[PDB]
Backbone:
């Protein structure tokens, strides 16, 4: 009925970053999260091992810098009433919206999650929801504009998702709350 | 202002 789903990725440990922000680590504790959807770029099993301490169900797709080449390129999952698609995004050449709507139809999902830009974004179009959690470490990218650490928590109940977007802004964890309802 | 969340109470990140 009620499911908390953690969505994160682009940690880039240890090449670009060595850990998640300590304030995030203090919030991410076992016993709460039912599933973890990861956009990839961990990049090593050490960060995979960390996620498995948080939840018994971890789903990951292959980022362009992951060490594990067995990770699938894309994943579709059904959680409650929602079909959720997952892809790292370094394959999306114009996060372009005509491409995302196409991917939404190809995966046949209510929610499409992707990463690779390290910029948190979320929007709704025609009763489909598109999420990018950003980088949970605030890892640098090419030509960046600052790059705030961020991750996403989805609160899924019946046909409503309430998404909480956690961001490390200055010295504080700050949150935005999003509602997504499907017909 | 502030927002209650499953992981605790935090400041809102909204620019307004």
Residues:
């Amino acid at each position: 009925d009620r499911m908390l789903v953690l969505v994160l990725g682009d940690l880039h440990i240890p090449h670009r970053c060595n850990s998640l922000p300590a304030k995030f680590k203090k919030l991410l504790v076992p016993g709460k999260i039912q599933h973890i959807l990861c956009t990839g770029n961990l990049c090593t099993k050490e960060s995979y091992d960390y996620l498995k301490t948080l939840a018994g169900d971890v789903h990951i797709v292959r980022g362009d810098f992951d060490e594990n080449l067995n990770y699938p390129e894309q994943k579709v999952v059904t959680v409650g009433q929602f079909k959720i698609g997952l892809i790292h995004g370094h394959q999306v050449i114009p996060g372009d919206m005509a491409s995302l709507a196409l991917l939404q139809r190809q995966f046949d999902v209510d929610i499409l999650i992707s990463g690779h830009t390290h910029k948190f974004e979320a929007f709704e179009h025609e009763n489909k929801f598109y999420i990018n959690p950003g980088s949970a470490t605030g890892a640098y990218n090419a030509l960046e504009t600052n790059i705030i650490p961020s991750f996403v928590l989805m609160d899924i109940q019946a046909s409503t998702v309430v998404t909480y977007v956690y961001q490390l802004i200055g010295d504080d964890v700050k949150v935005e709350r999003i509602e997504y309802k499907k017909p | 202002x502030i927002i209650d969340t499953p992981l605790g109470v935090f400041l809102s990140s909204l620019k307004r």
